[PDB]
Amino acid sequence: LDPRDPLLRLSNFFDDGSVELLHERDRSGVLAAAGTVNGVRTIAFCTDGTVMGGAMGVEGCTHIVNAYDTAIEDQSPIVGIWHSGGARLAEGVRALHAVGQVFEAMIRASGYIPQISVVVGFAAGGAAYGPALTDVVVMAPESRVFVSGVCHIVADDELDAYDRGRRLVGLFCQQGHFDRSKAEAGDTDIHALLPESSRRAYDVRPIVTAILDADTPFDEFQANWAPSMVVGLGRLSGRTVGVLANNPLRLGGCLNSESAEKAARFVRLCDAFGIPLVVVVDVPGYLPGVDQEWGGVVRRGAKLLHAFGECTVPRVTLVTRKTYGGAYIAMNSRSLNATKVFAWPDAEVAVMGAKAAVGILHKKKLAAAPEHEREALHDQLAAEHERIAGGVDSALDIGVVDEKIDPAHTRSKLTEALAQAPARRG
Amino acid sequence: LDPRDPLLRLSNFFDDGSVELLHERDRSGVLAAAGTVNGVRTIAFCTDGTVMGGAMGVEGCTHIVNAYDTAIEDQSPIVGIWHSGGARLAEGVRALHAVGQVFEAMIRASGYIPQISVVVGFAAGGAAYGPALTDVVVMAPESKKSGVCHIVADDELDAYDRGRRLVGLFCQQGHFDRSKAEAGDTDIHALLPESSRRAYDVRPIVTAILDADTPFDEFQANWAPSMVVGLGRLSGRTVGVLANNPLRLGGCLNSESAEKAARFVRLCDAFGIPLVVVVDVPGYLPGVDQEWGGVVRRGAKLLHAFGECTVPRVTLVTRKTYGGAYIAMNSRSLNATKVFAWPDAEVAVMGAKAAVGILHKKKLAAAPEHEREALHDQLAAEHERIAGGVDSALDIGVVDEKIDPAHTRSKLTEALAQAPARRG
Numbered sequence: 045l046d047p048r049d050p051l052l053r054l055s056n057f058f059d060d061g062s063v064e065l066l067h068e069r070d071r072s073g074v075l076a077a078a079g080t081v082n083g084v085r086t087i088a089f090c091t092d093g094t095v096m097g098g099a100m101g102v103e104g105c106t107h108i109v110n111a112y113d114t115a116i117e118d119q120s121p122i123v124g125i126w127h128s129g130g131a132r133l134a135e136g137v138r139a140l141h142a143v144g145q146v147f148e149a150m151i152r153a154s155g156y157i158p159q160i161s162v163v164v165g166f167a168a169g170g171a172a173y174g175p176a177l178t179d180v181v182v183m184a185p186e187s188r189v190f191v192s193g194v195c196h197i198v199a200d201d202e203l204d205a206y207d208r209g210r211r212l213v214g215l216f217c218q219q220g221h222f223d224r225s226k227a228e229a230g231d232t233d234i235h236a237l238l239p240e241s242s243r244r245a246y247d248v249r250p251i252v253t254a255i256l257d258a259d260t261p262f263d264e265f266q267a268n269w270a271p272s273m274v275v276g277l278g279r280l281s282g283r284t285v286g287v288l289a290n291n292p293l294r295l296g297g298c299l300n301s302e303s304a305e306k307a308a309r310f311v312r313l314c315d316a317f318g319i320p321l322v323v324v325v326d327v328p329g330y331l332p333g334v335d336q337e338w339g340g341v342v343r344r345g346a347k348l349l350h351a352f353g354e355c356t357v358p359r360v361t362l363v364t365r366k367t368y369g370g371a372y373i374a375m376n377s378r379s380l381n382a383t384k385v386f387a388w389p390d391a392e393v394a395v396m397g398a399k400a401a402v403g404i405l406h407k408k409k410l411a412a413a414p415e416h417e418r419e420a421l422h423d424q425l426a427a428e429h430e431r432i433a434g435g436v437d438s439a440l441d442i443g444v445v446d447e448k449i450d451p452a453h454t455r456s457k458l459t460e461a462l463a464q465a466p467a468r469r470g
Numbered sequence: 471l472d473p474r475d476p477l478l479r480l481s482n483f484f485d486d487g488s489v490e491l492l493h494e495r496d497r498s499g500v501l502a503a504a505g506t507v508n509g510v511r512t513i514a515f516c517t518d519g520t521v522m523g524g525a526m527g528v529e530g531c532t533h534i535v536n537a538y539d540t541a542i543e544d545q546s547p548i549v550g551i552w553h554s555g556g557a558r559l560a561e562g563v564r565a566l567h568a569v570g571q572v573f574e575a576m577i578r579a580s581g582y583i584p585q586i587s588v589v590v591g592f593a594a595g596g597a598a599y600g601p602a603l604t605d606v607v608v609m610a611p612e613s614k615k616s617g618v619c620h621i622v623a624d625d626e627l628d629a630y631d632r633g634r635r636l637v638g639l640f641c642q643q644g645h646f647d648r649s650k651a652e653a654g655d656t657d658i659h660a661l662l663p664e665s666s667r668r669a670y671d672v673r674p675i676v677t678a679i680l681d682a683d684t685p686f687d688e689f690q691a692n693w694a695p696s697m698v699v700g701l702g703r704l705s706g707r708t709v710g711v712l713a714n715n716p717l718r719l720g721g722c723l724n725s726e727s728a729e730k731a732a733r734f735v736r737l738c739d740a741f742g743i744p745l746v747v748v749v750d751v752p753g754y755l756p757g758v759d760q761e762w763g764g765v766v767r768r769g770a771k772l773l774h775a776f777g778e779c780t781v782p783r784v785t786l787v788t789r790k791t792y793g794g795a796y797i798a799m800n801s802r803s804l805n806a807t808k809v810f811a812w813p814d815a816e817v818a819v820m821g822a823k824a825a826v827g828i829l830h831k832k833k834l835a836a837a838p839e840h841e842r843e844a845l846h847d848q849l850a851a852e853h854e855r856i857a858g859g860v861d862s863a864l865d866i867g868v869v870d871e872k873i874d875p876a877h878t879r880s881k882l883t884e885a886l887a888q889a890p891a892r893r894g
């Protein structure tokens with residue numbers, strides 16, 4: 045069945061004329077090959093959708109395990125192209141065990157070599173879980189992962205999927221270096237991208253792209269899952285960086301169960317492969333599930349604290365508009381040993397908005413006030429409260445912000461901090 | 471003397487007369503002390519519910535951090551007694567910062583010294599997240615947040631009692647004792663129902679395996695009830711137990727049972743606690759909402775947990791182990807230390823009837839509608855005779871040994887003892 049022929053799929057993915065088979069073709073249901081991706085030595089394996097639906101058996105699984113063993117030994121990235129209905133039922137338990145051995149190999153590779161899955165067709169049973177164990181999953185629209193968060197990148201078509209896969213091994217395996225000249229040349233007034241009013245929502249994504257190199261794609265992960273949080277890989281003066289940013293357009297930009305988990309997973313992934321982090325903070329609080337279930341955000345929030353806390357790659361924080369309460373601590377604060385914390389001049393760092401704060405601290409005085417005088421008293425109390433608290437100057441005194449910067453130098457200030465940090469220690 | 475008094479609470483927790491304060495008592499909202507729990511040196515801190523509802527401030531947080539540093543230095547377990555509304559609003563960002571420094575100390579301690587949280591009063595904001603970063607959380611009733619609490623006590627005093635026991639489980643792990651294993655052997659199989667199609671609570675099985683004297687400290691009994699996990703002692707040695715529970719969801723794996731098992735596996739692995747995995751699982755379930763996202767993601771995490779695990783971990787198949795769930799429940803392919811099976815156990819891709827319906831679907835379809843439902847039975851009968859049995863699994867090599875259920879304890883104990891403390 046030509047289009048799903050594994051040699052062809054492997055050929056479309058690798059650099060032209062670089063494919064070198066790791067074993068002889070057969071009817072096992074997988075073909076594994078060595079090759080190159082823009083010069084980078086890469087291992088890949090393709091399930092054979094032209095043989096029994098691509099169903100996995102002992103012999104095919106063995107080829108994948110050998111492929112993994114090969115990539116591990118040479119420290120090469122390994123890409124799996126997936127199209128498969130699951131384990132070969134007629135092989136019984138023997139196939140279950142072999143599928144398990146595939147899992148076990150992916151686990152040995154975890155955080156040691158990059159693992160990229162490209163799902164180009166139906167993926168079920170063991171063929172759904174395999175990709176779930178890898179670092180990044182690319183899905184072509186002629187696919188579905190069955191047996192939401194599982195899929196990181198959705199491509200336009202099978203060829204686009206290979207193209208994104210190729211870029212991903214570039215981001216992991218040709219990380220480059222920071223360049224000050226390039227960082228400065230790309231500087232613009234990122235602050236101008238915000239709305240005029242502090243109360244208005246906006247998509248954070250243009251801020252992100254303005255920080256990142258103009259001529260390089262921002263590869264956003266899981267865009268439609270936990271949309272209050274944006275995460276992804278891009279280049280900053282040519283250097284691969286990971287970006288996390290609250291997106292005020294969705295849920296006020298609040299943290300919650302899924303956004304915390306999304307951010308936590310992405311942090312551990314960048315940490316594992318030496319990829320520095322830009323954390324763009326504009327977060328006013330956090331949220332329970334619709335049913336007032338707080339257990340999710342607690343558990344996942346703790347996982348996020350733990351991820352930043354244990355992180356050792358450079359990770360710099362930029363407060364754009366506001367950062368409040370517990371969500372402030374979680375978003376790469378000084379208390380979790382952020383490399384450096386930056387703030388735009390009109391940013392707020394506080395427990396909560398002044399009016400909210402004052403409305404708690406002086407609940408009794410406010411309620412004792414005459415109804416028609418109450419709001420004026422509330423406003424006046426709030427004005428004094430923010431005279432003394434919430435501002436960048438105050439945050440600099442405390443030492444939770446390191447530097448107030450000109451928004452027009454954002455891109456070059458972040459770059460300077462990341463470049464001059466140690467590769468490891470936080 | 472007020473019940474919420476931090477010195478009182480610390481004194482009730484520690485061995486009588488052992489308390490030694492780590493700082494001068496003050497208005498900070500925290501008191502921290504050294505002491506012993508059945509002989510072992512332990513550090514503890516207690517939030518002061520009498521001062522501002524126990525709200526966390528800069529100076530109180532500093533006492534907590536110091537206690538963590540002290541514990542990290544001496545490699546002592548550290549117990550937090552929590553009763554607190556969260557950060558002191560009026561101290562502003564400084565209090566937030568200090569709370570974050572408490573988080574950071576807990577993270578530095580993570581997997582290095584045991585951390586126990588005893589929540590005896592209202593706990594909110596930063597005071598809910600503190601405990602969430604520890605290893606085991608005990609809650610007194612007097613204090614929706616599903617999955618966060620590991621153990622519910624009967625009251626405050628019982629909570630200290632369970633906490634004290636947890637220190638012993640983590641810091642007095644002991645040695646396996648082959649003679650005590652044997653002395654406790656019984657026919658555990660006799661606890662199974664007559665029919666293999668009948669559901670049962672797996673907890674008495676777990677109980678019969680564990681030491682008859684020692685309590686079974688179940689974690690999160692009410693969350694993900696198709697999965698049972700907890701700590702106990704096997705022949706005097708602290709072990710972790712995971713067991714499918716056929717009583718709920720047919721004992722199937724699903725999104726939250728995979729999560730519950732994975733977190734527990736990672737905890738035991740962190741502290742050198744060997745695992746006993748009691749398997750009776752017919753398959754796995756999707757979400758709500760036939761979405762597979764949760765089970766795919768959490769299941770993957772469970773695979774990762776067993777795969778990377780280096781403590782001894784032995785599997786015992788009692789009745790069923792099917793398909794993908796078979797793989798995940800500590801199979802040979804994920805380097806299980808050893809895999810045991812009772813004589814009647816099935817290790818298979820699915821039920822024989824179901825298996826045949828797919829393996830022979832074209833041939834079943836091509837048969838006359840009247841003589842099909844009888845051919846199905848015939849083919850299932852042949853299938854059942856050549857696949858699915860322990861003997862088959864033994865030959866394949868995914869079961870190491872079929873065992874007399876009357877010798878479960880000693881067999882498990884022998885396999886756990888012979889394994890290295892770290893490999894697999």
Ligand SMILES: CNC(=O)Cc1ccc(Oc2nc3ccc(F)cc3s2)cc1O
Pocket residue numbers: 299300304330341344345346348349369370371373374555556557558566569594595596597599
């Ligand atoms: C009474 N008010 C307080 O105590 C303030 C406060 C302080 C810390 C805190 O901890 C965390 N919050 C999050 C929120 C999201 C997330 F993903 C992680 C965390 S950790 C939570 C808090 O309400």
Ligand SMILES: CNC(=O)Cc1ccc(Oc2nc3ccc(F)cc3s2)cc1O
Pocket residue numbers: 129130131140143168169170171173191723724728754765768769770772773793794795797798
């Ligand atoms: C076509 N049929 C198959 O391919 C059978 C099959 C094989 C492997 C598999 O992988 C996993 N399953 C789970 C289930 C729960 C869980 F918590 C983890 C895993 S991993 C899943 C499978 O349906």
